[PDB]
From a paper:
NADH-cytochrome b5 reductase (b5R; EC 1.6.2.2) is a flavoprotein containing one FAD molecule. A single-spanning transmembrane helix anchors the protein on the inner surface of the endoplasmic reticulum membrane. b5R mediates electron transfer from NADH to cytochrome b5 (b5). Flavin compounds such as flavin adenine dinucleotide (FAD), flavin mononucleotide (FMN) and riboflavin (vitamin B2) are utilized as cofactors of proteins for various oxidoreductive processes. The isoalloxazine ring is a redox center common to all of these compounds.
The valence electronic structures of FAD as well as the protein environment are experimentally determined and analyzed in order to investigate the properties of FAD in b5R. The most unexpected feature of FAD in b5R is the lone pair distributions around the N5 atom. On the other hand, we have to worry that the electronic distribution around N5 is an experimental and/or analytical artifact. However, we believe that the result is relevant for two reasons as follows. First, the radiation damages could be suppressed by the collection of data at low accumulated doses (1.8 × 105 Gy for the first data set and 0.9 × 105 Gy for the second data set) at 40 K. The values were smaller than the Henderson limit of 2.0 × 107 Gy applied to ordinal measurements around 100 K by more than two orders of magnitude. The second reason is that the valence electrons were clearly observed for both Data I and II, even in the residual maps of the ISAM refinements as well as the deformation maps of the MAM refinements. These multiple results enhance the validity of this study.
Numbering used by the authors: 1001 to 1272
Write the structure that this text describes.
Amino acid sequence: STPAITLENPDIKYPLRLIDKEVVNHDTRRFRFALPSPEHILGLPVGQHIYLSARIDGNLVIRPYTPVSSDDDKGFVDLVIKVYFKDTHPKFPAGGKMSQYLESMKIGDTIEFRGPNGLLVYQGKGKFAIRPDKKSSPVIKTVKSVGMIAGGTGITPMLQVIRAIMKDPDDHTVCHLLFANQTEKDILLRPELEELRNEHSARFKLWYTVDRAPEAWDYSQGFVNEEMIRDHLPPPEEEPLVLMCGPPPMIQYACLPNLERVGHPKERCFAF
Ligand SMILES: Cc1cc2nc3c(=O)[nH]c(=O)nc-3n(C[C@H](O)[C@H](O)[C@H](O)COP(=O)(O)OP(=O)(O)OC[C@H]3O[C@@H](n4cnc5c(N)ncnc54)[C@H](O)[C@@H]3O)c2cc1C
């Protein structure tokens, strides 16, 4: 038998109750929500995400999230959230709508989840099912390696796939992650990524870049560029799948042009 799934229908919203909220650091939270019973699982295929929706100051707001939990976790779903507070970043004085709304929730409050969503599903042992659009059949392709470029919150789609591969000892897919952030302080999920590197270095390659670097810095500084893609993703001759998730100017200016310069087919670079 298999556990009961929570996300039974992708057009249904499921209000889930907040049970724990961890202050990871000043602006990072881990929120745990209860599933309908302690024996349920979420029902989120690897590669897909959920949406949160709420009425936030009178207007509907919907945003995608990839949990840090998996379908191995019974009874709960965990989201790691960067809270974008007002009056912090000069280009974003209002801060972020859903992340500040999540920060305001009280234990016992509910929020609507929906899913699964997303055009990519990882089928295991290097095989990805990628739809060109939602109403269309997936292209299945099997790769030996996966390049991953994450910026900021775009790490959680990558971590979900990395963790699904590493937990299968007979999955020989090698993942190469290049993870960009504004500063060293702003990096999410660093201990979790470094645990995976400690345990799985043969199949997991980890590199960081930061827009501005600390005094003591072992990795890259600046935006993702051609050199970093040569040095930190599989070469195009190996025909890796390239996955990306990050802010639009990062994808548009830093990632796609440089993936193309290296020779990866741009048309095949998938953005979550
Ligand atoms: C597939 C997928 C999975 C995701 N998973 C996660 C996840 O697990 N965790 C997560 O936290 N997010 C995740 N995101 C991002 C998430 O969807 C939202 O974009 C994020 O929560 C911010 O939404 P918001 O409503 O708070 O901000 P919005 O109101 O939408 O603000 C717009 C943008 O303003 C910028 N911004 C606002 N304030 C600041 C500031 N203080 N500093 C810097 N920039 C700022 C941010 O770049 C923000 O995205 C994911 C996105 C995708 C596509």
